[PDB]
Structure formats: structure tokens, C-alpha cells
Design a protein around this ligand. Sequence first.
Ligand SMILES: CC(C)=CCC/C(C)=C/CC/C(C)=C/CC/C=C(\C)CC/C=C(\C)CCC=C(C)C
Ligand SMILES: [Cl-]
Length: 274
Amino acid sequence: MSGRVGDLSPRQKEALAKFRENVQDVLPALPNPDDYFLLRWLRARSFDLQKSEAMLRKHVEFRKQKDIDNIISWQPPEVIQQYLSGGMCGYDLDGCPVWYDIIGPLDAKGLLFSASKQDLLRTKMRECELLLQECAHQTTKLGRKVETITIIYDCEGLGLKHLWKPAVEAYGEFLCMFEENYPETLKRLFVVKAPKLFPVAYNLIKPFLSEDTRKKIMVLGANWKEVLLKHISPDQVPVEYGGTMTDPDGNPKCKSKINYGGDIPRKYYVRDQV
Ligand SMILES: CC(C)=CCC/C(C)=C/CC/C(C)=C/CC/C=C(\C)CC/C=C(\C)CCC=C(C)C
Ligand SMILES: [Cl-]
């Protein structure tokens, strides 16, 4: 069985009960430690109690060290706010928030020359917290638990410039952070408009991904818009990605929700090498 609330085996139920007993000392430090929450850690370690507990306790320390309880009120530095692409836009057919990643126009080198790695990673943590907050809001709105996210991963324009080694290493640090602190949060990731370079790029970051994450990555072909609309209502998808959603001013890219990156002006640079 699936290891989710309502659908646990006897062994899974027993493990959940022991797990809650075993980690009860840190539950007051945690956001809404309901069965759904605990089961994400258990599923991520195949209900191994020792490993699940180690994973959760490491997360507790992460939350303290990164001040996660207050990260939503932290606005990133100007260069990040203005040029770090992507954004939350719409909900899928099951009510899960959708996040757009826009790789092509991302100036990875400009970002690392203009911001600390710590602030870039902190910005990604904040995005994850914003997505989980949206899931909690959807849960209330829909009257059923929403705790996963759909990602549209736009690889149009993916190029050798993105595989600059310090960029790959920084991105791997984000991916490790994601896997260790947001287990069982990804529902599906649709790669769209991937060029021929994609398999090499994918191989560079595969070591940072869990098996669970890898199974949720779907690389789409020429009919990607049609596939997206099998999963998300058109009114929830930007015109740019095959739907009917626009900004209030009519812009088909929904730039009020999604950042489209761009090359970073030199006035933002803070260092000469990385
Ligand atoms: C530190 C940070 C996260 C951003 C700052 C700017 C930098 C250094 C960007 C790195 C450049 C970049 C985007 C590298 C990855 C390019 C795309 C691939 C290697 C394709 C395979 C990627 C996936 C299949 C995505 C998996 C993502 C999740 C959340 C599971
Ligand atoms: Cl080197």
C-alpha cells in the first residue's frame, strides 16, 4: 500500500506510531506535525525508523540554522529578486500548486558574480516554504490534504553556459537541500522544450536526486502543451505554456507571477571570480 494517511499497512501503521513516540520531543518545533507530515519522512526512508528519525532531526537543526519559521518575510537582494527566474503560477487539476522553472534565460554566472551562494540557496528555501504555504491554503480551500507540487521545467535555451562548473555545484547544493528538507513534496516535474544537451546536463545533477524524485521526472516531446493540459486546466496555465492565463495587463507570459531572468547588468557584480 501507498504509505499515505488512509492507506497504511499494519507494518506502516505500527512504524508511524513508534515514529511519533520517538520524535515527540522535537514536534513542538515543527509546523503542523500531523500524520501526513510524519509520513513524508517515513516514506523517504522506506519506514526505517532510525533513518527516518535521523533525517527529521537533521531537518530540525536546518530549520533553526536557517531561521525557516521567518523566511517567508525575507525578501532577497535586488539582483536575485529581479533576475532569478521562475515562479508560482496556477494550480493543477488536483489542486496542487504549480511552479515554473525557466532555465534558458537564467544568467547563472551573473548571479554567482552578484550574490552569495548562501543568499541564492536561501532564496530557493524560501520558494519551497512559499509552495508549502500554498499547499496548506489549498488544503483548507478544498477540504482535503494538498501537500505536493507540480513543476514545469522549461529547458528551452539550455546551453553550455549553464553547465559552468560553479553553477552546477551550487545547483547540486540546492538539490541536496531540497531532498533533505522537503521530502515527498514533488508530485511531478515536466521537462519541456529540452534541447540535445539535456541528457548530459541531467547526468550532471542525477547524483543529487533521490530515486523518488527521479521517478517523477517526465521529459516531454513536441506535444508538451497537450500533455500539460491533461494535468492542468487551461485557465491555470500561462498562454506562453499553452493555456489562457495572462497578467491583468494582458501579457501572455504572466510576468506578474513568473520571472523570466535575463542577463545581469554589471552594476550588480560584487566579485571578479568564483
Ligand atoms: C544556487 C541556485 C539554485 C541558482 C543560482 C544560479 C545558478 C548557479 C544556476 C545553476 C545553473 C543551472 C540551472 C543548472 C541546472 C540546469 C538544468 C539541468 C542540469 C537539467 C536537469 C535538471 C532537472 C531534472 C531538475 C531537477 C529539479 C528538482 C527540483 C527535482
Ligand atoms: Cl578545476
